[PDB]
From a paper:
As we purified and crystallized several Dpr–DIP complexes, we were also able to grow crystals of DIP-η IG1 and determined its structure at 1.9 Å resolution, which revealed a homodimer. These crystals only grew in the absence of Dpr1, which indicated that the heterodimers are likely more stable than the homodimer under the crystallization conditions used. The homodimeric DIP-η structure closely mimicked the Dpr1–DIP-η heterodimer: When DIP-η monomers were aligned, the other subunits, DIP-η in the homodimer and Dpr1 in the heterodimer, were only displaced by an RMSD of 0.78 Å for 87 out of 102 Cα atoms, excluding the variable DE loop and the mobile half of the A strand. The crystal structures also reveal how DIP-η can accommodate binding to both Dpr1 and itself, with significant differences in sequence at the interface. For example, Tyr103 in Dpr1 (Y, F, or H in Dprs) is replaced by Ile92 in DIP-η (I or V in DIPs). This results in rotameric differences in close-by residue Ile87 in the common DIP-η subunit, which is further accommodated by other rotameric changes in the common DIP-η subunit, and sequence differences between the heterophilic and homophilic partners. The DIP-η homodimers observed in crystals also exist in solution. While size-exclusion chromatography is not an equilibrium experiment, a binding isotherm based on elution peak volumes can be calculated, yielding an apparent KD of 11–45 µM, an order of magnitude weaker than the heterodimer. Furthermore, we performed SPR experiments where low density DIP-η surfaces are created to prevent homodimers on chip surface, and data is fit to a binding isotherm while correcting for DIP-η dimerization in solution, yielding a KD of 14 µM. Here, we also show the presence of DIP-η and DIP-α homodimers in solution and present a symmetrical DIP-η homodimer structure that closely mimics heterodimeric Dpr–DIP complexes.
Residue numbers in the entry:
A (entry chain B), B (entry chain A): 38 to 143
């Protein structure tokens, strides 16, 4: 039995934030179902989170969701090196994703 | 206490295979410890596996390991669109990774 793919309800909300403040990036998914939402950093090619699990060893990354639709990654105490592109990816076949950015102003 | 990072014992052996055969890529890691090995398709940064869990919906992907040292991703019944670069990634900080290539000949 085939099920619908999840669909993104809105584009990724980007964030601009000063060094040392906390940053958030949010992905809004409709009809997630049995699929999973993963955050990745695109510059560094690094897996950050999958569902409610932080994969990276970086202790400043957190992840939370409400109703499996709004998925918000937290980057605690941001440094200048956190500036870059971040992907919200769903494990459909083919894979679907959208990208946002965190800008760290100096 | 700090622990060692895992280290790759050898490069990933590439593989060339004809359409319809099974293919394998192997990543050999030393001192994995509490860290995790993930396989990704580099073209799109599609998360394929994490540890012994297949993340992608693609039912032709499999993962196995022996003693948390040798990590082997299998691609069953390969197609031309399986040709490309694959990354073996460890969730250290900073992230560590090796890449291999699956060439599919028609
Ligand atoms: C975030 O930035 C990208 C390009 O910089 C843009 O396409 C996207 O729509 C932005 N997000 C929002 C919510 O506007
Ligand atoms: C794998 O392939 C790449 C290019 O296809 C090559 O440069 C590299 O040396 C190969 N790795 C090994 C271990 O042979």
């Amino acid at each position: 039995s085939r099920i619908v793919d999840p669909k993104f309800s809105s584009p990724i909300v980007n964030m601009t934030a000063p060094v040392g403040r906390d940053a958030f990036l949010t992905c809004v998914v409709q009809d997630l179902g049995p699929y999973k939402v993963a955050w990745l950093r695109v510059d560094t090619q690094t897996i950050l989170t999958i569902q409610n699990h932080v994969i990276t060893k970086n202790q400043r990354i957190g992840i939370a969701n409400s109703e499996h639709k709004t998925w918000t990654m937290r980057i605690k105490d941001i440094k200048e090196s956190d500036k870059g592109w971040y992907m919200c990816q769903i494990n459909t076949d083919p894979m679907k994703s959208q990208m946002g950015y965190l800008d760290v102003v100096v």
